[PDB]
RNA sequence: UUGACCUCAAAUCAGGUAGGAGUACCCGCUGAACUUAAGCAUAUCAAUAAGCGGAGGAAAAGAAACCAACCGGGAUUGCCUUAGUAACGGCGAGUGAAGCGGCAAAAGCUCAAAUUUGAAAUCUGGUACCUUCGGUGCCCGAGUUGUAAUUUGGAGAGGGCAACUUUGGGGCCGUUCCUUGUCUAUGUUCCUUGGAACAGGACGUCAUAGAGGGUGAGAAUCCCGUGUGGCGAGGAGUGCGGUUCUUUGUAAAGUGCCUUCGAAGAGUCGAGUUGUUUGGGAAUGCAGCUCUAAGUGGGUGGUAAAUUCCAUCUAAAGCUAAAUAUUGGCGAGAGACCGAUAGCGAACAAGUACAGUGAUGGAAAGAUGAAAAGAACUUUGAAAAGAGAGUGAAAAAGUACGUGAAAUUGUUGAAAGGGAAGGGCAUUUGAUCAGACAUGGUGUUUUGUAUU
RNA sequence: CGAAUUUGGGUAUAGGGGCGAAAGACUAAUCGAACCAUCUAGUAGCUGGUUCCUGCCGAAGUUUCCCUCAGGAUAGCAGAA
RNA sequence: UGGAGGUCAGUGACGAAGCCUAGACCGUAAGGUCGGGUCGAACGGCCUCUAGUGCAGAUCUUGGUGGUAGUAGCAAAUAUUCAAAUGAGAACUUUGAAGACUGAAGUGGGGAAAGGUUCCACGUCAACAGCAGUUGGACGUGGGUUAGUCGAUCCUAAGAGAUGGGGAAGCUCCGUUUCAAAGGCCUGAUUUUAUGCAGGCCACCAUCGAAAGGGAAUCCGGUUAAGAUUCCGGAACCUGGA
RNA sequence: UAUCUAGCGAAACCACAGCCAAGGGAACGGGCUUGGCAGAAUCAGCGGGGAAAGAAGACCCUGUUGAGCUUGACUCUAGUU
RNA sequence: AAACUUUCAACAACGGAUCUCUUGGUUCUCGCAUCGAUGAAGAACGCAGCGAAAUGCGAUACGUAAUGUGAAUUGCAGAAUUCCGUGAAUCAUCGAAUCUUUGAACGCACAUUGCGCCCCUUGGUAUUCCAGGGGGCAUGCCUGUUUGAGCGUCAUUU
């Protein structure tokens, strides 16, 4: 809030063959007699300084959110939209894909990857793994160094180690049927997420 | 300064509001801290229910005359009718209000019944007993809606 | 090498004073050598040894006066706690815990009960 | 991924800690791994390097080069090993810094502190 | 003559305390103007900036001389709302709360005014010990112009009877956590480029660990770490079941009927003026001056004044965590932030160099290379340096070093030139360049007819 | 050019104040109100500037009121839906 | 154009970004794509989100660079010349020989304020000495300032300024002897004591304030790269004490 | 001194630049139109022109911009009575 | 067709733009409460084998003591038999010390490195003079001790 204003600059006025911009004065520095207090000046403040009370979070209707979530779920059901989103579902026997209490109560990441291979999301695992790439901006030193695709979303009803196993499994996200975030039901506002359901998850969706 | 057909607005922004702006970025942090403090207090008073028993009290004005809510504490007359003392009730967690008065038989009876139900619903552990842990509940307000 | 604090503590006060005076003499001789020579760290070694002897003497003297003042109030201000000015002005634990007879009787008669709600 | 709230995933913070770590933290950083035979003998994968160990450079322009460390330049974040030098064209030998992560240890200079360290890590000697 | 008491002194008397720093927040005092009103004086800015005094981790406030007018609520504080509303305002510009309601947090209380009067039962201090944040004994002193116990209005005290119920201590075994320390997974296997593999290609392994960083390029598996778990030390300390141990015995507290009482804060309340302030308007609060109370009295009940009722509290004395604050200090985690003229003035020996008598003002300034391996040696030159070498992946990285734009310069060279140059339309000349004839065609004299 | 002289040092007078044999003079190259920092990014109906392309449409300097006459509101002209 | 969510399992050390290029293609254009050089580590297309998002000007800000232009100019203070030496190199350095000037209210010999090592020696010319430099008040390294008598220190002047005390909400103001209970040295009793004592008098009634006022006392000769009324030799004096 | 050399070496100013006559034009052109003309590179002067440079005219007007000063302006105020 | 402007399949200059990077800032959130007469914050001098600055420290001076780790520091030297250890370290932790002149700053003053007084000890054939070492002497307030003053006022006669 005080950037560009930590000076006692005062305009020289007219009659001195210089622009009327305020000038830090004094002497013996090189900063003396130098323009200040302006977006056009070096060292001055910017135009319309950025403020913290800008709007950051935007309110949304609950019914609108639920409509979007239901549309995302139905788009997940639609098989063409998953291919359009590019989720390597050309090998899945049919969509939606339902697994059972074995995957619900799975415990180790090795058997998690094995179950993913059995069902057909191992291609998505490889997609994410080979898609991990460096960013193309300043996020690399702003703590967003690498970018990668999104893998399957395994949705469950009860947590018995599935979350931890598929948590270390790259790309794959896990969700509870109670929450079912739109943020991964349609990443990047693109419909057709690859979602792996369980039987309990299907009944809880009901 | 004034222009086409528009409502006349009264925006009180002729002071240094930019210095006096408070933005609640800490909503989530405050909620987390409040839940953490509630959990810590519950652990500190592990058998106790984290809440005092509040009486049933009628809202004052004619706008809210229809509604009933929670008061501050039970009257001394209500405590006497329940059959104990104000200090004892304060120790066992009944909120006691000295300045409230009982001029309504319905409210008197409702609060006396609340006190009786609370007494039948609690178990005061003896000072030098076996300490029979009793699986605390976390809300007397929820236990006696 | 440098003398070590444990044998400095083992040795007596006369030995400590003699060692200190010999260390000062060696410092003077070594400093003349430094004036006559380009570079040498034995002067730092000797200064460290002098510091060790001086701190051993200081700690033994402070321990002696502490044992002299042991058991009695009004200790010298260099021996009492240096915690903080505010902490020292603050009430002691006994003073803070002190309560009146009325409040003591009230607390004894009506403490906080350990009640619970199950059924 | 990380799960604790006392560990930071900040690149700037991590680099600051690395570059401003003290001498002991630097020793822990310049910890180095043992060879296959050494690991089979003891049961330890990596150890903080020492001055008088024996190291086999297995990565870099001097891959597969045996020697013994001459110094552990914690300030330079490397180790200097004898027989691994550069010949300044005036005819001088200047040590070449090699990273302990790139080298491998083929012999342990064992004192009782190192033996206790192996025991704590879970070695068998 | 000798002892006191009261008041006031003096001691390098014995022991203590205050100052100052610090402003991010907090409690007050003092206090503007620029500005807006399209002028300007009330107003606004603003009960703000500047100045002054005073604390803490929070402060302040706080358990009603409250809000209300209801079937009443019930300390304080904060949020949503009330509400840009009631109201104030050259009724213009503008300003502008509070009750109720939902929620967060909830904690309640204690002094004065009482004869202990069958025993000042109270306390500081000095000595002597001890189990030393203190205890015990003794002796001075303070104190009867009042120190204990007992009571704080919600009550309570003194008496006459009533079936009762509750214990006391200083060290541990584990207890939010503080200082923390340590241990626990898996490739550096093989080919290609490269100076370096951390890149690409095969085979793998671990994973409650594929967060991050470093290593000669983009590394889960090379290192530190990360995930889950064990263990070891030094603490403020009640989160209690058992603790090494004599019996506190008339002893404190609560309670049920009655009887008599029931003390409750004064130059204060209140009133009149003056000034300031407030939304408070025949005056909201504060303060100066004048007058000056009462005891079922006194205050309030948002229109000034009689008179008659009602409702609600109990001032002129005091303490108290939490929810709240947070551009300061300490520690930590992050971001759709900035990226060396940006971001703090300061990424760097930055409040530095420097200027001013002084208050004060206040810069510029990052990058060789993976590694100095920082150019040995010969020669010209007085020397600086040059040429040749040498190191390096690169010297088109050589202190004046990552890349090295433009302005502005010297030189390969090309064209033009009678007091400007540049430009448009259109050709010519010179220079230079893309497009296009193996394109999906003949069936057999040439062939390099499963290739046509 | 022996004095109402000249001058060093130490002192006192500080900003609406000082000092002035009086010029609005001097008060650190600043004086018809110094300098420093802050309020302050003071206000400005008044100057200056206001950064990519193409397509379509496309004006007004006139009415009324205003301490209004270098400005606004209003109606008119124009665009879009 | 800078960032963000998706996707291209997109491009890349066999060369990304960037920059240069009267080379090419496309779009009416904003511009995009490619060819060739330099370069060495990241970057892009598509669907969306977002903004500190587009420069020719503002006597715009900061930095850099021109024509003018090898130009104006380097002309006050009378003035330089010959030889030698040293040096790569001499109008400028040193030595000698001439010629001159300041002409004792100096261009001499010291000091005050101020400066702070500029003093001196030895090396030494990258920058500075608006020409040059072998020289320097420049650069590098070192040396140098010696007091009982000279000053400060002591006194008080103009004045400043605590205390008692009184104002001010307060930072602080007044006041300096005023409406204050304002106080230290001598033969000393001569031996366990003790400026407690058989004793004595007063009256400035803090302090600061002058390196030119007042004031206790040192001179000569010699000595160094530089210090001397300070060192040395000689000859003295003052204060305090015994 | 200027001038020419050896060494050293700035600044003002600069939309682009630099030959005229008339015309018209914002009513006094270096550029536009018509005509006169027009030949590299330059040196010393020179002061007609560049409506030459120096400064957001200080004269005048406007602003609902000030300030110094005055008073029998409006509204107040220290002091005094 | 010489010398004097434009453009390079072109170099070399001047200059530091762009690109890439970042132990730095800026905002957000969370946790905690800790300055000083037991002398703070801030100054001024000095301390390293070679230091001018910066860091740290105070004549015990780039540090002493204690604890932990375990074999360094490194620009060049220096003691590597300390390296199976009561032990390197420009290490970490940090509880004992030291802490020059100052500074609220305290004996009085302060443009003085000025001027006092008290106590003890030592030396100068010394209680007084000088010197050396050590310990002290501020003000405003509170409680207490001692010594006092006041026909303020009680007990009221040699």
Tab-separated table of N, CA and C in Angstrom, chain A residues 45-105:
chain	number	residue	atom	x	y	z
A	45	UNK	N	4.586	4.213	-8.036
A	45	UNK	CA	3.557	3.200	-7.900
A	45	UNK	C	2.894	2.924	-9.244
A	46	UNK	N	2.266	1.758	-9.337
A	46	UNK	CA	1.561	1.355	-10.540
A	46	UNK	C	0.208	2.054	-10.623
A	47	UNK	N	-0.395	2.008	-11.808
A	47	UNK	CA	-1.739	2.545	-11.971
A	47	UNK	C	-2.745	1.623	-11.304
A	48	UNK	N	-3.633	2.205	-10.497
A	48	UNK	CA	-4.665	1.460	-9.789
A	48	UNK	C	-4.049	0.276	-9.062
A	49	UNK	N	-3.327	0.508	-7.968
A	49	UNK	CA	-2.630	-0.590	-7.294
A	49	UNK	C	-3.585	-1.715	-6.928
A	50	UNK	N	-3.106	-2.948	-7.079
A	50	UNK	CA	-3.931	-4.109	-6.782
A	50	UNK	C	-4.310	-4.120	-5.308
A	51	UNK	N	-5.574	-4.421	-5.038
A	51	UNK	CA	-6.129	-4.350	-3.698
A	51	UNK	C	-6.606	-5.724	-3.256
A	52	UNK	N	-6.529	-5.970	-1.948
A	52	UNK	CA	-6.944	-7.255	-1.404
A	52	UNK	C	-8.452	-7.440	-1.403
A	53	UNK	N	-9.232	-6.362	-1.333
A	53	UNK	CA	-10.679	-6.497	-1.273
A	53	UNK	C	-11.310	-6.652	-2.649
A	54	UNK	N	-10.535	-7.078	-3.640
A	54	UNK	CA	-11.097	-7.542	-4.897
A	54	UNK	C	-11.925	-8.802	-4.654
A	55	UNK	N	-12.862	-9.065	-5.557
A	55	UNK	CA	-13.666	-10.277	-5.476
A	55	UNK	C	-12.832	-11.470	-5.923
A	56	UNK	N	-12.646	-12.435	-5.027
A	56	UNK	CA	-11.898	-13.649	-5.321
A	56	UNK	C	-12.793	-14.870	-5.445
A	57	UNK	N	-13.721	-15.056	-4.515
A	57	UNK	CA	-14.669	-16.159	-4.560
A	57	UNK	C	-16.027	-15.639	-5.007
A	58	UNK	N	-16.645	-16.344	-5.950
A	58	UNK	CA	-17.911	-15.941	-6.549
A	58	UNK	C	-19.004	-16.880	-6.058
A	59	UNK	N	-20.109	-16.301	-5.595
A	59	UNK	CA	-21.241	-17.081	-5.119
A	59	UNK	C	-21.911	-17.815	-6.273
A	60	UNK	N	-22.439	-19.003	-5.987
A	60	UNK	CA	-23.139	-19.815	-6.974
A	60	UNK	C	-24.384	-20.401	-6.325
A	61	UNK	N	-25.457	-20.488	-7.104
A	61	UNK	CA	-26.665	-21.147	-6.633
A	61	UNK	C	-26.396	-22.623	-6.370
A	62	UNK	N	-26.924	-23.118	-5.249
A	62	UNK	CA	-26.786	-24.533	-4.917
A	62	UNK	C	-27.414	-25.409	-5.991
A	63	UNK	N	-28.588	-25.013	-6.487
A	63	UNK	CA	-29.246	-25.783	-7.534
A	63	UNK	C	-28.437	-25.768	-8.824
A	64	UNK	N	-27.798	-24.642	-9.144
A	64	UNK	CA	-26.920	-24.601	-10.310
A	64	UNK	C	-25.733	-25.541	-10.143
A	65	UNK	N	-25.126	-25.550	-8.954
A	65	UNK	CA	-24.023	-26.471	-8.694
A	65	UNK	C	-24.466	-27.918	-8.857
A	66	UNK	N	-25.637	-28.259	-8.314
A	66	UNK	CA	-26.116	-29.634	-8.394
A	66	UNK	C	-26.487	-30.011	-9.823
A	67	UNK	N	-27.045	-29.068	-10.584
A	67	UNK	CA	-27.306	-29.298	-12.001
A	67	UNK	C	-26.013	-29.605	-12.742
A	68	UNK	N	-24.966	-28.820	-12.481
A	68	UNK	CA	-23.687	-29.059	-13.139
A	68	UNK	C	-23.114	-30.415	-12.753
A	69	UNK	N	-23.222	-30.786	-11.476
A	69	UNK	CA	-22.715	-32.083	-11.032
A	69	UNK	C	-23.467	-33.234	-11.693
A	70	UNK	N	-24.798	-33.138	-11.760
A	70	UNK	CA	-25.586	-34.186	-12.401
A	70	UNK	C	-25.276	-34.281	-13.889
A	71	UNK	N	-25.115	-33.136	-14.556
A	71	UNK	CA	-24.740	-33.147	-15.965
A	71	UNK	C	-23.372	-33.782	-16.163
A	72	UNK	N	-22.433	-33.509	-15.256
A	72	UNK	CA	-21.114	-34.124	-15.348
A	72	UNK	C	-21.191	-35.633	-15.159
A	73	UNK	N	-22.034	-36.094	-14.235
A	73	UNK	CA	-22.203	-37.530	-14.021
A	73	UNK	C	-22.781	-38.192	-15.270
A	74	UNK	N	-23.806	-37.574	-15.856
A	74	UNK	CA	-24.401	-38.132	-17.066
A	74	UNK	C	-23.430	-38.094	-18.242
A	75	UNK	N	-22.591	-37.060	-18.323
A	75	UNK	CA	-21.562	-37.017	-19.353
A	75	UNK	C	-20.519	-38.101	-19.144
A	76	UNK	N	-20.201	-38.408	-17.886
A	76	UNK	CA	-19.358	-39.560	-17.592
A	76	UNK	C	-19.990	-40.838	-18.124
A	77	UNK	N	-21.304	-40.985	-17.940
A	77	UNK	CA	-21.998	-42.141	-18.507
A	77	UNK	C	-21.878	-42.171	-20.025
A	78	UNK	N	-22.009	-41.015	-20.670
A	78	UNK	CA	-21.922	-40.955	-22.127
A	78	UNK	C	-20.514	-41.345	-22.555
A	79	UNK	N	-20.414	-42.358	-23.419
A	79	UNK	CA	-19.116	-42.913	-23.786
A	79	UNK	C	-18.352	-42.031	-24.762
A	80	UNK	N	-19.053	-41.336	-25.660
A	80	UNK	CA	-18.371	-40.508	-26.650
A	80	UNK	C	-17.662	-39.328	-25.997
A	81	UNK	N	-18.259	-38.751	-24.954
A	81	UNK	CA	-17.654	-37.596	-24.303
A	81	UNK	C	-16.367	-37.962	-23.575
A	82	UNK	N	-16.263	-39.187	-23.060
A	82	UNK	CA	-15.019	-39.610	-22.427
A	82	UNK	C	-13.895	-39.675	-23.454
A	83	UNK	N	-14.176	-40.223	-24.637
A	83	UNK	CA	-13.182	-40.226	-25.704
A	83	UNK	C	-12.842	-38.808	-26.144
A	84	UNK	N	-13.847	-37.931	-26.215
A	84	UNK	CA	-13.593	-36.541	-26.580
A	84	UNK	C	-12.673	-35.866	-25.571
A	85	UNK	N	-12.888	-36.126	-24.282
A	85	UNK	CA	-11.976	-35.652	-23.251
A	85	UNK	C	-10.638	-36.375	-23.285
A	86	UNK	N	-10.548	-37.505	-23.979
A	86	UNK	CA	-9.280	-38.190	-24.137
A	86	UNK	C	-8.865	-38.961	-22.907
A	87	UNK	N	-9.659	-39.964	-22.530
A	87	UNK	CA	-9.408	-40.740	-21.323
A	87	UNK	C	-9.120	-42.206	-21.622
A	88	UNK	N	-8.625	-42.511	-22.822
A	88	UNK	CA	-8.093	-43.833	-23.163
A	88	UNK	C	-9.078	-44.947	-22.814
A	89	UNK	N	-10.344	-44.721	-23.146
A	89	UNK	CA	-11.412	-45.652	-22.815
A	89	UNK	C	-11.793	-46.513	-24.016
A	90	UNK	N	-10.911	-46.614	-25.011
A	90	UNK	CA	-11.161	-47.499	-26.140
A	90	UNK	C	-11.051	-48.970	-25.764
A	91	UNK	N	-10.531	-49.282	-24.577
A	91	UNK	CA	-10.378	-50.658	-24.130
A	91	UNK	C	-11.373	-51.053	-23.048
A	92	UNK	N	-12.015	-50.086	-22.401
A	92	UNK	CA	-12.996	-50.405	-21.356
A	92	UNK	C	-14.151	-51.177	-21.977
A	93	UNK	N	-14.567	-52.312	-21.405
A	93	UNK	CA	-15.639	-53.097	-22.041
A	93	UNK	C	-16.922	-52.313	-22.237
A	94	UNK	N	-17.293	-51.482	-21.267
A	94	UNK	CA	-18.435	-50.593	-21.409
A	94	UNK	C	-18.374	-49.548	-20.308
A	95	UNK	N	-19.020	-48.416	-20.565
A	95	UNK	CA	-19.062	-47.305	-19.619
A	95	UNK	C	-20.516	-47.097	-19.212
A	96	UNK	N	-20.815	-46.903	-17.920
A	96	UNK	CA	-19.894	-46.751	-16.788
A	96	UNK	C	-19.257	-48.063	-16.342
A	97	UNK	N	-18.073	-47.984	-15.741
A	97	UNK	CA	-17.343	-49.154	-15.275
A	97	UNK	C	-17.560	-49.317	-13.778
A	98	UNK	N	-18.021	-50.497	-13.374
A	98	UNK	CA	-18.360	-50.783	-11.987
A	98	UNK	C	-17.445	-51.888	-11.479
A	99	UNK	N	-16.860	-51.675	-10.304
A	99	UNK	CA	-16.011	-52.662	-9.647
A	99	UNK	C	-16.669	-52.959	-8.303
A	100	UNK	N	-16.035	-53.778	-7.466
A	100	UNK	CA	-16.729	-54.289	-6.291
A	100	UNK	C	-16.002	-54.047	-4.970
A	101	UNK	N	-16.483	-54.719	-3.922
A	101	UNK	CA	-15.940	-54.539	-2.583
A	101	UNK	C	-14.465	-54.900	-2.490
A	102	UNK	N	-13.952	-55.746	-3.385
A	102	UNK	CA	-12.520	-56.026	-3.376
A	102	UNK	C	-11.723	-54.754	-3.635
A	103	UNK	N	-12.103	-54.004	-4.670
A	103	UNK	CA	-11.463	-52.720	-4.928
A	103	UNK	C	-11.808	-51.708	-3.847
A	104	UNK	N	-13.001	-51.809	-3.259
A	104	UNK	CA	-13.360	-50.885	-2.185
A	104	UNK	C	-12.457	-51.061	-0.969
A	105	UNK	N	-12.127	-52.303	-0.624
A	105	UNK	CA	-11.337	-52.620	0.558
A	105	UNK	C	-9.880	-52.918	0.233
